[PDB]
């Protein structure tokens, strides 16, 4: 099956360089122009670079011109993107993609839309250093209500980089649970919350423990959430 696989993504400081690779399977790589397209978190698609089949002709978006270099190793079924002078604004999932039809020179190189895309690789550009989250309770506070459904949760604040994983009661509780997408704060650190709705009558007879893991900081926290 026609396939593209990207790698090389990582978390890097502004000004540094990364080299992304895109390994290709089941077609004549050197007969196809190739593309890089990026997608910033929560955003749409943005074209980045294109390279002719023969590697002798390249085009860049205005956003990355003078900073990125696209290249290809026609010996090894593989496409590259060298990303220099990185900016925070470069943070995105980068995908390579293959032009949908063959196109070689016969007075200009011809380019059309792409058909197959890779799963992508993530490049995160930030001045932040590794930091473990603080985990705070989101407690049913205060006491007096009219009964029915209550909500509780954990606020997982000020970590870097993504991701954190959260579960409740070691994965035993998924019903009523919502774990929100992280948000990037102006501080450069991420924050998210996970909540669960439960019967108000259960708050002191049931146990609710949020399990938070952040591998980069080797943080493992099990926070019991109880009414204040």
């Amino acid at each position: 099956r026609v396939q593209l696989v990207e790698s090389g993504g990582g978390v890097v400081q502004p000004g540094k360089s990364v080299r992304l690779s895109c390994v290709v399977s089941d077609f004549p790589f050197s007969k196809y122009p190739m593309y890089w397209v990026r997608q910033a978190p929560g955003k749409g698609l943005e074209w980045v670079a294109a390279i002719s089949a023969d590697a002798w002709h390249v085009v860049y978006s205005g956003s990355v011109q003078g900073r990125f270099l696209v290249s290809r190793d026609n010996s090894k079924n593989i496409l590259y993107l060298e990303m220099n002078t990185l900016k925070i604004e470069d943070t995105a999932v980068y995908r390579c993609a293959r032009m949908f039809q063959e196109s070689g020179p016969p007075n200009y190189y011809y380019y059309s839309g792409m058909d197959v895309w890779g799963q992508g690789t993530t490049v995160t550009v930030s001045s932040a250093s590794t930091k473990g989250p603080s985990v705070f309770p989101l407690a049913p506070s205060s006491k007096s209500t009219s009964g029915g459904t209550a909500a509780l949760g954990c606020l997982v604040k000020d970590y870097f980089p993504e991701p954190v994983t959260v579960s409740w009661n070691s994965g035993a509780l998924t019903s009523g649970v919502h774990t929100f997408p992280a948000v990037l704060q102006s501080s450069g650190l991420y924050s998210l919350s996970s909540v669960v709705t439960v019967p108000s009558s259960s708050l002191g007879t049931q146990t609710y423990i949020c399990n938070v893991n952040h591998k980069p900081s080797n943080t493992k926290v099990d926070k019991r959430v109880e009414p204040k």
Binding site: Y35, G44, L45, E46, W47, A50, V59, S61, G62, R95, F100, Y111, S112, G113, M114, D115, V116, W117, G118, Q119, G120, S134, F136, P137, L138, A139, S141, S142, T149, A150, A151, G153, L155, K157, H178, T179, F180, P181, A182, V183, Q185, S191, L192, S193, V195, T197, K228
Partner: protein
């Protein structure tokens, strides 16, 4: 640059019913060779984009004939006949007439269901956090539909601005609802300065906006 204007930005669909998405370009997409360089991509939850339609109307091999592309010049449409639940996700048009290749802003397709008002909850900052000099106040809107909702923070009746961030879940696979959190961030000193913290929620499932609130320290 050719700018691509995609409408509507979002669309809720009833399975079995048709759906139409339009794409307008700021310049004509007709090439010298008589081909018009307009493509449509679908991006399902957690997946990479996939080609649906190439050069206005041609279906990529394997794509269901429920997808039909049409148009010319600057005006294009992707119409999905007999929408299925697996059609949810984002759709993007793209032009390759000239560099830079440019995409439309996307259309988000979700599943229609009956209106469901949010259940609203408010959480004061924990004592643990306050010890560290910062206060986060959290408002939760649970299990609502449709996605459109407004959340505003009032502190001693003063509308807050610039000090909150929202986050929203994907449409739920079982009940087709959304949930949303809004977090208000204040310094401890600012938090201690005021008494009443309220989050005001406006949603079409509510007759009037709902306000949840607490008094600091109580």
């Amino acid at each position: 640059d050719i700018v691509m204007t995609q409408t509507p930005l979002s669309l809720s669909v009833d399975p079995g019913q048709p759906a139409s998405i339009s794409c307008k370009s700021s310049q004509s997409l007709r090439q010298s060779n008589g081909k018009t360089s307009l493509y449509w991509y679908q991006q399902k939850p957690g997946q990479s984009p996939q080609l649906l339609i190439f050069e206005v109307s041609n279906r990529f091999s394997g794509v269901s004939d429920r997808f039909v592309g049409s148009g010319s010049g600057t005006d294009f449409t992707l119409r999905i006949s007999r929408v299925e639940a697996e059609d949810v996700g984002f759709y993007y048009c793209m032009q390759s007439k000239d560099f830079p290749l440019t995409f439309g802003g996307g259309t988000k397709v979700d599943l229609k269901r009956t209106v469901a008002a949010p259940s609203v909850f408010i959480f004061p900052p924990s004592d643990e956090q306050l010890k560290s000099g910062t206060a986060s106040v959290v408002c939760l809107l649970n299990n609502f539909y449709p996605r459109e909702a407004k959340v505003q923070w009032k502190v001693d009746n003063a509308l807050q601005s610039g000090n909150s961030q929202e986050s929203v879940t994907e449409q739920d696979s079982k009940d087709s609802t959304y949930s949303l959190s809004s977090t208000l961030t204040l310094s401890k000193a600012d938090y201690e300065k005021h008494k009443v913290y309220a989050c005001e929620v406006t949603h079409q499932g509510l007759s009037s906006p709902v306000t949840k609130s607490f008094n600091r320290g109580e």
